[PDB]
């Protein structure tokens, strides 16, 4: 009778606004199950991520509030669009479960990677990827965790980014947070990261796309390393002496490698026939991959370098490339710790604005 209602989705409950029905589930985010739904009002498909008592943990609470804010202040046609927050409870006293209502993209990379793409399509998808990426970068924010399962595309060939539990400014300042395969060496071998970490992923993601399968697979966090330098090759001494001794000892001990050339890494037999006039050459995407799939974090390409790059610039629209960073009210910063309870407030606090 009141504002809400529940539905039994498996061993989960969604209590949500009557206005949203017909919930299938769709996946888990960083820390919430997410559900597809009908918006009665808007008469349009949505996503609903529920996060169960996020305040239970310095993990949860932190990397949840993040999303909250981030989601809100975020403003770019390549990030998934927030459409609503809420909680059913009466007050801080009662409070626990949050819900986040978002746009429902048709699909996600996993099975784009599946079909064989025309250069243009491939390129475009990348293009956009980066432009979105550019966005948070332009605000000091780093996704930290981009993957197929995180990129969503629409049947017109629009493409967006998801889930912001992970996103923050540089470090280190958190071990096995990020997804195994798309871990960049500066992470694999925890040295601490900077924003062109995201570029690496894009590389694998793109690679994967072209490749047909995961680029650097790897059965366990440690076996990853090998896979990287199998294909890419044992990094320089100059790189090495930056690792922590404890770690390097091992790395150096790992047998030496040339690795392949990107061409053999990614032969044409995989690419489609080519464009009208160049820019969209196989060699050129290789040349991209080449500047992103670089073991050295410091000897790597930027995004504005990635958008300058020939294979990408063909669609270059500065009103997509260089719009304003979002504004984070700086009372929040992605680092500082709080209390067992302090958090419960912040959220309810931050939720109460939004709803």
């Amino acid at each position: 009778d009141n504002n809400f209602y529940s539905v039994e989705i498996g061993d989960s409950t969604f209590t949500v606004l009557k206005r949203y029905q017909n919930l299938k589930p769709i996946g888990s985010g960083a820390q919430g199950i997410v559900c597809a739904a009908y918006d009665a009002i808007l008469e349009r498909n949505v996503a609903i991520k529920k996060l169960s008592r996020p305040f239970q943990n310095q993990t949860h609470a932190k990397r949840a509030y993040r999303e909250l804010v981030l989601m809100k202040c975020v403003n770019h046609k390549n990030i998934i669009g927030l459409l609503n927050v809420f909680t059913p409870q009466k007050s801080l006293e009662e409070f626990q479960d949050v819900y986040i209502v978002m746009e429902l993209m048709d699909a996600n990379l996993c099975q784009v990677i599946q079909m064989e793409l025309d250069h243009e399509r491939m390129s475009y998808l990348l293009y956009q990827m980066l432009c979105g990426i550019k966005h948070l970068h332009s605000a000091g924010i780093i996704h930290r965790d981009l993957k197929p399962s995180n990129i969503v595309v629409k049947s017109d060939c629009t493409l967006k980014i998801l889930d912001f539990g992970l996103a923050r400014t540089a470090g280190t300042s958190t071990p096995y947070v990020v997804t195994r395969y798309y871990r960049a060496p500066e992470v694999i071998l925890g040295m601490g990261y900077k924003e062109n970490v995201d570029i690496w992923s894009v590389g694998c993601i793109m690679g994967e796309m072209i490749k047909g399968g995961v680029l650097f697979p790897g059965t366990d966090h440690i076996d990853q390393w090998n896979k990287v330098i199998e294909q890419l090759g044992t990094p320089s001494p100059e790189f090495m002496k930056k690792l922590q001794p404890t770690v390097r000892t091992y790395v150096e001990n790992r047998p030496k490698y040339a690795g392949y050339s990107f061409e053999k890494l990614f032969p044409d037999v995989l690419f489609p026939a080519d464009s009208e006039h160049n820019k969209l050459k196989a060699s050129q995407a290789r040349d991209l991959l080449s500047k992103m799939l670089v073991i050295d974090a410091s000897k790597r390409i930027s995004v504005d370098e990635a958008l300058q790059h020939p294979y990408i610039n063909v669609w270059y629209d500065p009103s997509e490339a260089e719009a304003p960073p979002p504004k984070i009210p700086d009372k929040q910063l992605d680092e500082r710790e709080h209390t067992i309870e302090e958090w419960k407030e912040l959220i309810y606090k931050e939720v109460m604005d939004l709803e």
Partner: peptide, 10 residues
């Protein structure tokens, strides 16, 4: 060089 407006997820 025109941006594409379809994507197939068959």
């Amino acid at each position: 060089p025109k941006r594409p407006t379809t994507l197939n997820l068959f």
